[PDB]
């Protein structure tokens, strides 16, 4: 009774846990009450309970600091009880741990402990380890003496002492600066999926021994370098406690014949002896490339050796093998057969939200100035991966150190804590780092949950509603579709002039549905045809299936018809190798996988009619140039971020810019915004955009869609009636 499952917390605070209300009522405790936590090896912790809408009823959410003190790991269970008899302390003695007091001196109490405890009212217990972050260092402290016992709340009027040599870490506790799950920024969904696959086999091996179910024995992670493939594999081992063995392709292959096979076998034998264990094989495509792509006897032998060692995992109890590759189809297909590596997770590239999370993670210890805006950085760092974002944070820290601290400190090993903590990193230091760094993954496809909302689209009121009926209704009201024998549509094709919002429509529905948006462009479909690599069609649809829920957007759907000649071509049809594979993958996709396909074309008259048959992109929506009322909405929507002067007549502009697309109206607003900003900056060497700024912007703005292009689109739309 009163037992709760240990899981991660959103709140990072060293004394806060979160429960779901039904457990707070059964435990007879209220929001803000102090509770005691009973873990393993006669170890306890004291904390305050809050609540949120994310914790499940059976779980208790806590951070790493609390789990370390209780000597528990994610997936374990602890007892919780209220303790309303908690009172304030009088005197406590807190000392740092030697593991973190390396290269730092000075008055650690005034720099760390006093800001940490002063007006903080934190519950503490004798033996509690907690981490205080600042000055670009993470220093952990232990409570060694308290007048009240075993626990008390530290009030601002209590006496806190800190005298004595740093404490050597005990073998029953781990360093709080070790890699864990809270060091992984983007790809949180992928980490959650892996946790479900791995944490239980390793944390509770007794359940798999007794219950007739098979654990995963091999997980393949893939994505560009620098995205966290090795960080996840190590973080999982550190959190579950399994021994981590490191293998990499090129090192094993650099050995002589017979040595490469022996070394690979030894790693597996050591994992069994140290089970539970995780074997991580990096650059899997280098150690075990496709045999149909190899020539040498050693190349075929090392693949066979890995295949037998993977199969031997039925006898090697509690050993899970993880592997990392750049491309899921660059490894011998035998490795992905039932057993062996029967699970895989698409790590990919962090999106704008993930990039911000990574920047926040690698600034935990950094003191940032008020002018620092990490969201602005995350939006500028397109094509960057975690390896690049970490570099940006460290480089910004170094520049702040060289500007200030090198005028204070000597070329030595030890720096005063006060000097380090007095340093703040400004936005200029981050912008400098951005000029020095270069994205390592700029061309690879990035999957993101878009931030486009319905309020971002001017006009098209009926199309926005239509998409909700096409995408949300089949899963929000499935009983009505069954009742009337309706087959939900699998996708819709948009056609019309460019720059009218086709992209926003696909993103906006993905946004409200909280679905991943996958952008496929014409050049990808064109490359597949000419390079005779149509197998990449399966990769696209497989990404959608693994990214589900998602919206898979195929731009420039006409690119295939054009490649066949478009306006003229030969005497045949539009069918070809690439579209044949696309149609096959669509037909085999189930609507219950929460994958919706949206297409777009600027030449609908040449689209292979096959794509418009039932089961494919059977629905057709015309997106014309915005009309008078829509153009006004577009202009006003773009200006929501900047005050507009009363002398600006946006309705007049809409009445004049009759041939302008939504893309062209955006340039007008954005150009007028830039002009107003320039004047504002110059005034200090203004509060709103003036009519003069719009009139000047109109001197450069032009319509992108000609009159003849409009007639072509209108005549086609009329032809379809």
């Amino acid at each position: 009774p009163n037992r709760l499952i240990v899981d991660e917390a959103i709140n990072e605070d060293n004394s806060v846990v979160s429960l779901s209300q039904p457990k707070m009522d059964e435990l007879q405790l209220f929001r803000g009450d102090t509770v005691l936590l009973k873990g393993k090896k006669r170890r306890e912790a004291v904390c305050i309970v809050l609540s949120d809408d994310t914790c499940s009823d059976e779980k208790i959410r806590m951070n790493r600091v609390v789990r370390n003190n209780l000597r528990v790991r994610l997936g374990d269970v602890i007892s919780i009880q209220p303790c309303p008899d908690v009172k304030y302390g009088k005197r406590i003695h807190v000392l740092p741990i030697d593991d973190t007091v390396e290269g730092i001196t000075g008055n650690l109490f005034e720099v760390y402990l006093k800001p940490y405890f002063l007006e903080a009212y934190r519950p503490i217990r004798k033996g509690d380890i907690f981490l205080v972050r600042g000055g670009m260092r993470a220093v952990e402290f232990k409570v060694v003496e308290t007048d009240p016992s075993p626990y008390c709340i530290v009030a601002p009027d209590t006496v806190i002492h800190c005298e004595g040599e740093p404490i050597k870490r005990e073998d029953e506790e781990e360093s709080l600066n070790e890699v864990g799950y809270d060091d992984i920024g983007g790809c949180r969904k992928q980490l959650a999926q892996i946790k479900e696959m791995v944490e239980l086999p390793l944390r509770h091996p007794a359940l798999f021994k007794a219950i007739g179910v098979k654990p995963p024995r091999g997980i393949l992670l893939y994505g560009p370098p620098g995205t966290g493939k090795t960080l996840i594999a190590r973080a999982v081992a550190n959190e579950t406690g399994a021994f981590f063995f490191l293998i990499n392709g090129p090192e094993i292959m650099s050995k002589l014949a017979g040595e490469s096979e022996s070394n690979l076998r030894k790693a597996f034998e050591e994992a069994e002896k140290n089970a539970p264990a995780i074997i991580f094989i990096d650059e899997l495509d280098a150690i075990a490339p496709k045999r149909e792509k190899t020539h040498g006897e050693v190349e075929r032998r090392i693949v066979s050796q890995l295949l037998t060692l993977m199969d031997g995992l039925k006898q090697r109890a509690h050993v899970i093998v993880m592997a990392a590759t750049n491309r899921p189809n660059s490894i011998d297909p035998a490795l992905r057969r039932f057993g062996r590596f029967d699970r895989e997770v698409d790590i990919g590239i962090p999106d704008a939200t993930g990039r911000l999370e990574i920047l926040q993670i690698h600034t935990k210890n950094m003191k940032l100035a008020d002018d620092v805006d990490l969201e602005q950085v995350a939006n500028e760092t397109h094509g960057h991966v975690g390896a690049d974002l970490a570099a940006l944070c460290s480089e910004a820290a170094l520049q702040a150190i060289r500007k200030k601290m090198d005028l204070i400190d000597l070329e030595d090993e030890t720096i005063d804590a006060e000097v380090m903590n007095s340093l703040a990193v400004t936005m200029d230091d981050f912008r400098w780092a951005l000029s020095q760094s270069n994205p390592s993954a700029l061309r690879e496809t990035v999957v993101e949950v878009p931030q486009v909302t319905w309020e971002d689209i001017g006009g098209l009121e009926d199309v926005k509603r239509e998409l909700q009926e096409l995408v949300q209704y089949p899963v929000e009201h499935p009983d009505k579709f069954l009742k009337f024998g309706m087959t939900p549509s699998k996708g819709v094709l948009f056609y019309g002039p460019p720059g009218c919002g086709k992209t926003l429509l696909a993103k906006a529905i993905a946004n409200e549905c909280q679905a991943n948006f996958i952008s496929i462009k014409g050049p990808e479909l064109l490359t597949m045809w000419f390079g005779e690599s149509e197998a990449n069609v399966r990769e696209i649809f497989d990404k959608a299936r693994q990214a589900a829920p998602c919206v898979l957007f195929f731009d420039e759907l006409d690119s295939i018809a054009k490649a066949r000649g478009g306006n003229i071509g030969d005497g045949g049809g539009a069918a070809d190798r690439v579209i044949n594979q696309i149609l096959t993958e669509m037909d085999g996709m189930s609507t219950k996988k929460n994958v919706f396909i949206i297409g777009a074309t600027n030449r609908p008259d040449i689209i292979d009619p096959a794509i418009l048959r039932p089961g494919r992109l059977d629905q057709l929506i015309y997106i014309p140039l915005p009309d008078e009322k829509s153009r006004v909405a577009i202009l006003k929507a773009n200006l929501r971020k900047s005050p507009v002067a009363k002398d600006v007549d946006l309705e007049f502009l809409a009445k004049m810019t009759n041939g302008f697309s939504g893309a062209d109206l955006t340039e007008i607003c954005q150009r007028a915004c830039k002009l107003a900003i320039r004047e504002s900056i110059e005034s200090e060497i203004v509060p709103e955009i003036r009519r003069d700024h719009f009139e000047e912007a109109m001197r450069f703005a032009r319509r992108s869609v000609s009159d003849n292009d409009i007639r072509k689109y209108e005549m086609f739309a009329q032809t379809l009636q």
Partner: peptide, 20 residues
Amino acid sequence: TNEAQMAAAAALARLEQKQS
């Protein structure tokens, strides 16, 4: 109890100032 509610108010202030 009352000392715990003051501890909760301090924890809520720290979490909101840093997260918001």
